[PDB]
Amino acid sequence: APLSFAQQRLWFIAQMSREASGAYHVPGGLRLRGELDEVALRAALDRIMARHEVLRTRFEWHEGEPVQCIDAEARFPLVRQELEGEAAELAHWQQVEARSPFDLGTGPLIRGRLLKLQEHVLLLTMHHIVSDGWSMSVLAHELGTLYRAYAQEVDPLPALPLQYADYALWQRRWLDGERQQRQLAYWQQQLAGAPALVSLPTDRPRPALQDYRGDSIELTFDAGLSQGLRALSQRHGTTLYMTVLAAWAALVARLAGQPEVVIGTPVANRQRAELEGLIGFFVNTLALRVDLGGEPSVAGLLAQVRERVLAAQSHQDLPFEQVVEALKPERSLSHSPVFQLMLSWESSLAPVRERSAQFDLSLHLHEAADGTVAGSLTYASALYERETVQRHAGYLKALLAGMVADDTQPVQRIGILGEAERHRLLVEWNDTAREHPRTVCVHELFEQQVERSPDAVALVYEGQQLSYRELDRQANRLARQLKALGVGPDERVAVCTERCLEMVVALLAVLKAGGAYVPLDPGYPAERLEYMLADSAPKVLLRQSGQTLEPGAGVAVLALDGEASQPWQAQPAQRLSRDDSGVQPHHLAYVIYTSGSTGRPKGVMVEHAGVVNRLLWMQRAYGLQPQEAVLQKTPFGFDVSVWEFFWPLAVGARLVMARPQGQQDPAYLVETIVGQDIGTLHFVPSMLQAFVDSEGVQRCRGVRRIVCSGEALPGALARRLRQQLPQVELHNLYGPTEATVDVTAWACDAAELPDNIPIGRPVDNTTMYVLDAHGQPVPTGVAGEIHIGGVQVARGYLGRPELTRERFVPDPYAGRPGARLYKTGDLGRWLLDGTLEYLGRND
Ligand SMILES: Nc1ncnc2c1ncn2[C@@H]1O[C@H](COP(=O)(O)O)[C@@H](O)[C@H]1O
Ligand SMILES: [Cl-]
Ligand SMILES: [Mg+2]
Known part of the structure; x- marks a missing residue:
């Protein structure tokens, strides 16, 4: 049961008083070994009392200000003690001795606890208003000398030149002078x-x-x-x-x-x-x-x-x-x-x-x-x-x-850095080596699932359905038409279509033909689509009927749907052999353009092997089952759609293709989640906020997984999602396009979620490094630039080799010749539990 805000702060205020009781005293102790001679202590104890005027000085209020009251020379207040144990006796006695409060009004400001444990424990205590750190060191000088004098008094042996009242009177004049002003200046x-x-x-x-x-x-x-x-x-x-x-x-x-x-x-x-x-x-x-x-x-x-x-x-x-x-x-x-x-x-x-x-x-x-x-x-x-x-x-x-x-x-x-922490930062917290088949391509994961469940539902779009075998056969027909048009390994195929069944047919057919697909969202302005169409230099443009995008430049244009797409239905629906296409995991799977930061967009060339690793890790971590459904809601120009497309199709689940521009209707998302039994979907944190604020969001109790990526996930939003949907498993994923969608993940399963949601630990066969300006690892907790290694590092930027060598640098940690790191430009730090925390951009 949490305390209220007023209760919580009042607790901390009350403990500052307990902090004041112990921090305003000067404790100390001395071990006494010698003949039991108390007859000399009281003579030596009171001798130092009357010698210094501050030992017996009292303070009180008078006429609106504290006054100094020099008191008649008194005696020492010592308490008799007889120790009974050892550990618990000495530790507690010596603790309460320092925390025992005094009284500035009456009662002395020097306190002592003496005890017979032949051997005696001499505890001494003074108040900070009459002493400090040094004042007890000189208290040990006099106490040791006065006992020697009382064993073989005070002022006659060596008198004191001044007393604190003279120092305070001098300070009062100095604080009013010009030397105080110059020291203040x-x-x-x-x-x-x-x-x-x-x-x-x-x-x-x-x-x-x-x-x-x-x-x-x-x-x-x-x-x-x-x-x-x-x-x-x-x-x-x-x-x-x-x-x-x-x-x-x-x-x-x-x-x-x-x-x-x-x-x-x-x-x-x-x-x-x-x-x-x-x-x-x-x-x-x-x-x-x-x-x-x-x-x-x-x-x-x-x-x-x-x-x-x-x-x-x-x-x-x-x-x-x-x-x-x-x-x-x-x-x-x-x-x-x-x-x-x-x-x-x-x-x-x-x-x-x-x-x-x-x-x-x-x-x-x-x-x-x-x-x-x-x-x-x-x-x-x-x-x-x-x-x-x-x-x-x-x-x-x-x-x-x-x-x-x-x-x-x-x-x-x-x-x-010590060697232990350096090995923990570089090796132990990067122990993500997992044995995945490095011989399989993205479309082959789908083809392997077609053989396992050919009649299971694979695609859903506005009532229309395609089974795994029907989708595979449609993709095989289009892939043969692409092969007849020169599509092959590392060749690009631009795809311009709204969401529909044929969008997935196109993507699978490009991969089956051995090429790499280039998603062209029709919602983008024509100038942008024409640049990406010319920059990628594709062999074929797969175009939905109604789109007017024309490449020219000798690029073949094939209709993706409509009556003009009927010719390639005559192709046989059999699968292209592994040698008919010739594609291999190191060949390109897709080229996805990011807007850069300010300027021309850059095509990120991503190979099959990294996408397969990204997909195979996601199933091992989250276990998507064949009876579940995933919602394809992300525009396919963003690489988030990559796992939306190919994760369910590689494991046997079905993919529900969201209505084009359907979320313009404010109620479409909730109605589709409930109406189609959507179990997994993705949100950028800005869109997740609108989701938890939307009407009827609490009806989505069937949702299993929500993946958040692309922006910083605020902890308050993560906590808000729990209150709305207590059953959903929220996961925060981090990664740029140049590292295949995502490279770290953190499950928001802790009983109490922090305000800064960590981006987590590296995924399978992926390494993470937090480096300073000289490429050196920083200590745990220190901010530095995130560097990504492993199999998911992209090939580079299509047509920009100088920018590639600037951001894709040799990997000096992996122990593998030719390995490369990607400089993200993001600021991050390691937490002591081995999780990463996103802090912002380097610039
Ligand atoms: N989970 C995340 N938390 C914070 N920032 C992120 C996250 N994912 C991506 N980013 C940032 O967004 C950039 C592009 O991500 P994306 O849109 O996923 O390609 C990255 O380079 C990061 O700067
Ligand atoms: Cl260049
Ligand atoms: Mg990403």
Whole structure:
């Protein structure tokens, strides 16, 4: 049972308060090994309390603003504990200790949980309004020294030079001065026009409200990589933090497809030596804008990062909140402002696993004792899966290694893919090899079905019917007349007719005569039909009676129906032998013209073998049975009609030829579906929308399969079809004409359909590749240009050899000499489940 919209948002609002309870505290712990001497702790504990004025400072409202109340020096509030277990005891105790809220009014802001587990567990906690990250590190310096003094006080040994109230009084004057304005002018200039949101590929769409659920992984740079990065940093004058910042910004810009990347970094902001050792809120955030346009080298990028990091650390006094309200006074609610990725360098007991994510990714790294670099990468679980973050950390380590190998190469072309993912992308997700007969042509699939069911119904048109044997005999007669007119292998036969029984007779007869058919839709303007008729240079024009299209140019014209078609009824109805025609699977099956994009239409030459594979895959995936009917509704100038014609005829089903221009009657489609028991039909998504919006669509409960292709299928439309026809199996198919109708398919059978309906997995004997501008495979989730391989790649464009070599390129992956890929010009990406997602056009 789903929650309402008001209930769903109110839940996320209530959990932001739970996120605030844990993220506004500074937890920590220390393992104590030594003689049981509590007699020295309380003396050492209260000594650090009274030493720093912030440890006992209270806050409250007075005269419309929060006031600072310096309190009389008090004692430490420690709770006695006696541990009872191990795993569940320590993990839960240490968790609720950090999540236990304080009170800014009364009650102290330093909290401690001590326990005897000889050996004691000393948990400490401070509030962020009186401390930060460093403030606990100096809390460990004093606590360790004061216990030593109380074992062998505070201020007399080494007094503190200042207290936080003096820093706040100084900041109040600095914020009003002209140095604040100039630092505000630099940050307004540095981050002007910066990308508001990084487009890192996410495994799930970004929620409307930011989800603070977080998880983390562990990553380390081994002794070799940490050593090489130190030498690389020495050679370019950068520190080890700047070298990692350059690599991470280089990785993110490559993964997100953006030129610039903004990465945040927390700084202590204790620039003045007086503030060192003091306890309080000093940490500030700097937004680092790294540009990567122009394809810089490793040295050029490190020099850019060297300039921007130094300039950022010189203007680190301005609060980051004032940077936002100046640049972005109008911000979003689904992501953090200015930046969404943070890199913290923690150069130096241990804390627990970070389960909160204030940003998309937060990379924490530190320099270990053995010279190695270790840390964690915390990610928002609502955006990324764990395996995606692990591959992300692998890319960074791979990119850092390449920078050490050569600091002069282009940084954005360094290989980052691991061998496991590369093999999965290229081979494992393309394991579509299926054993189909590579010796059969398209018309022979029909002829084999004629022998199995000669008296079964094959064609239906406005009451007229043709059985499999009757259709085959009619096609054989016309095929012999075509053979007498020079039709043979690779020769074209133009066909100009409206939908009728004779349309299918013509197509089968051309294929039987060994030629390739060229569909000429009479609805197109005469100028277009005359160009395609001249460009294809056919041997014969099969013309329906009433059509006035005249080719000239020595082209033979045969009447397809009417009284003028009677002469070729005298031909014998027997089948032409395999040698009488001479056609083979590598010969052309049809030439279908696409309008290109802007200009003259181009004839796509498609061979028999690819069409047979496309048809044989469709039956294996969907199992069309002889008793079913398919509706021939798509104009035969579109290659969708190819499987509408030849899929049912190859398996024993019947094909219902829709009325010409019949859908002009708004009720014709529904009445024909019900009246003819239509089980399978095709829609382009724009036409499917009109179908689910049409009157009486719910009467079509007998429909079995709806194939969608040609456009992007919106998930809302797919979900609308379920509500109207709960029984129909919806399938999303993708593929251009140059790859034989379709090459990927995705069943819309999931219990919950996404808004972006995937185009799916490659079909039988077909391969798919997502490549960058240099023909290299991109990481999972990264957008790139779709390339198609396998048997369904067309021969090329009829009469345009230069465009053919431009879009039909050698296949370097198939391991087969002579194989070719088709560059689609479409943008796509792999999902982590091995399915493809259409994203749009490359241009
Ligand atoms: N299922 C689909 N989803 C999104 N786009 C598609 C799909 N099928 C085809 N296209 C686009 O339409 C172009 C031509 O497809 P077609 O009309 O089937 O030849 C392709 O090159 C793609 O850009
Ligand atoms: Cl050309
Ligand atoms: Mg297609």
